[PDB]
Ligand binder design. Structure first.
Ligand SMILES: [Cl-]
Length: 409
């Protein structure tokens, strides 16, 4: 319970600050307290939606984002689309990255809702929204889908089909975590060219697996970055090569005209025993790419929970949902740029002007964040800056307790 760590706040005061700081409009709190209507920016025939979730792909491993020269295929694709240079994960764990891009639900000191008992059925997801709207919905994974409780959460919440390890006929390579990312990506391309023959728009979540210790992946596929074959750096570089092979196929495919793709990490590679909130380690790549998506370098501070409202808007789906994440196809004032991030028991609220970190024992730290340096210094802020952070720190914990985030509509 977030109340126990950060202090109490009246539901009214809290909700008001959450709704106001969200920038969402047309709220209807009779059904659910943050239910809001957002019409899609795109208004043509509904597009397919492909989410290519990148296991542990932190910005530190991305060349185009200043880090190690580990992602030449992605770097190139970055120039070809809507690149987010100030994107932050809300968490450090895979299930929280799945939480963020399938539900848009903000973080708590607890586990992501993929693993919580109340969220196993009838929780809000874009999966069941799109399903209710006539979409086929699927999850493509290389390993065992029961892992991290994913299959159960996905099946209970709007996913139709689950494609997992048992469904791969002849993979080029199999490791401890399942088939390599190239096999995953061949399977994706197979499923998409399949679904595109059908009548339905589809929504697909595809989640990489190669980038896990002990780092098994095929030989002779990249000029390795490290001398040892099985390293994190090389697994990332393998995954990059594997993504490039997906897009080479994707661009000459029958679904290309009709689809929006997002390349986004679930979180950065974990760091341990960090103090407060290590901002740099929530920093992640995000790329939206597709026909009619124009190249753009977007420096607006955002979270991965802003992606589902953004993507629905891009694919032509009007969204009456309780999501408080931003539709970034629409203007966002500089003072509204923000990132929430949860590092275990610590919650951080990053804006262009300040960074507020809340820790157990109701301790409050206030800082100015140097974006170039990726370092922070002490800084005094208005009570309104602390209250906005606290209000957002508490929301998911309270919404979960009170069932404020259901799929009822
Ligand atoms: Cl997390």
């Amino acid at each position: 319970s977030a109340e126990q760590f950060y202090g109490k706040m009246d539901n009214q005061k809290m909700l008001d600050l959450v709704r106001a700081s969200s920038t969402k409009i047309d709220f209807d709190p009779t059904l659910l307290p943050t239910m809001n209507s957002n019409p899609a920016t795109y208004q043509g025939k509904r597009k397919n939606l492909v989410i290519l979730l990148q296991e542990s792909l932190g910005a530190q491993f991305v060349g185009s984002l200043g880090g190690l020269p580990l992602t030449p295929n992605l770097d190139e694709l970055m120039q070809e689309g809507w690149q987010f240079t100030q994107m932050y994960a809300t968490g450090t764990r895979s299930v929280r990255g799945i939480e963020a891009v399938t539900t848009g639900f903000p973080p708590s000191p607890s586990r992501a809702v993929v693993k919580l008992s109340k969220s196993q059925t009838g929780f809000f997801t874009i999966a069941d929204l799109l399903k209710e709207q006539g979409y086929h919905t699927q999850f493509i994974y290389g390993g065992e889908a029961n892992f991290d409780n994913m299959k159960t959460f996905f099946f209970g919440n709007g996913f139709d089909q689950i494609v997992e390890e048992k469904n791969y006929t002849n993979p080029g390579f199999v490791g401890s975590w399942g088939v390599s990312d190239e096999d995953l990506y061949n399977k994706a391309d197979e499923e998409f060219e399949r679904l595109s023959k059908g009548d339905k728009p589809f929504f697909s979540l595809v989640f990489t697996s190669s980038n896990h210790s002990p780092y098994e992946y095929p030989e002779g596929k990249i000029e390795q970055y490290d001398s040892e074959h099985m390293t994190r750096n090389n697994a990332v570089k393998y995954s990059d090569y594997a993504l490039g092979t997906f897009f080479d196929k994707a661009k000459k495919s029958s679904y290309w005209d009709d689809t929006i793709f997002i390349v986004i990490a679930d979180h950065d590679a974990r760091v341990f025993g960090a103090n407060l909130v290590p901002v740099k380690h929530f920093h992640i790549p995000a790329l939206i790419i597709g026909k009619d998506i124009q190249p753009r370098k977007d420096d607006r501070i955002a979270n991965n929970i802003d992606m589902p409202p953004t993507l629905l808007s891009l694919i032509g789906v009007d969204a009456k949902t309780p999501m408080i994440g931003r539709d970034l196809t629409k203007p966002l004032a500089r003072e509204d740029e923000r990132a929430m991030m949860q590092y275990d028991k610590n919650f951080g609220y990053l804006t262009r002007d300040n960074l507020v970190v809340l820790s157990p024992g109701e301790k409050v730290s206030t800082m100015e964040y140097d974006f170039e340096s990726q370092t922070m210094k002490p800084l005094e802020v208005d009570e309104s800056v602390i209250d906005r952070a606290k209000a957002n720190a508490l929301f998911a914990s309270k919404a979960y307790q009170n069932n404020w985030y259901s799929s009822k509509r």
